Homo-oligomer: A and B are copies of this chain.
């Protein structure tokens, strides 16, 4: 079976994301939903856009996407691979770069954070 990006996902920090159909070029869009208090009610939703690599039509493709945050001046990109895990579940293993806005090119060196996220299906 193929690991497919389309559907609803949640990650190891409680964020959720929904990705729509992936077209013939590999392109998808979706929404990324995050709480703005850890274990609390305030929820904000931002669009994401990206692609799945379709070379050799792998059953476990790599992909990447950009989340265009609507509640700050930052941007995050995620890249990873859609696996069928050893337990037979679909999992997206991703790493990300979070770019903050700085005012002066002299502060550019501290504007990028890095981390991972693992997503599994919300069914």
Question: Which residues of A pack against B, CB within 8 Å?
Answer: 13, 25-27, 36, 38, 47, 49-56, 58, 60-81, 83-86, 91, 93, 95-103, 105-106, 108-116
The copy count of this chain in the complex is: 4
Asked if A110 and B113 make an inter-chain contact with CB atoms under 8 angstroms apart, the answer reads yes
Q: Taking A49-B50, A74-B62, A77-B77 as contacts, is the C-beta distance between A109 and B115 under 8 angstroms? A: yes
Residues of B within 8 A of A73 (CB): 53, 55-56, 58, 61-62
User: What residue in chain B is nearest A37 (Cβ atoms)?
Assistant: B110
Asked if B79 and A99 make an inter-chain contact with CB atoms under 8 angstroms apart, the answer reads yes
The answer for the CA separation of A72 and B97 in the assembled complex, in Å, is: 22
Asked if B110 and A112 make an inter-chain contact with CB atoms under 8 angstroms apart, the answer reads no
Asked if A113 and B112 make an inter-chain contact with CB atoms under 8 angstroms apart, the answer reads yes
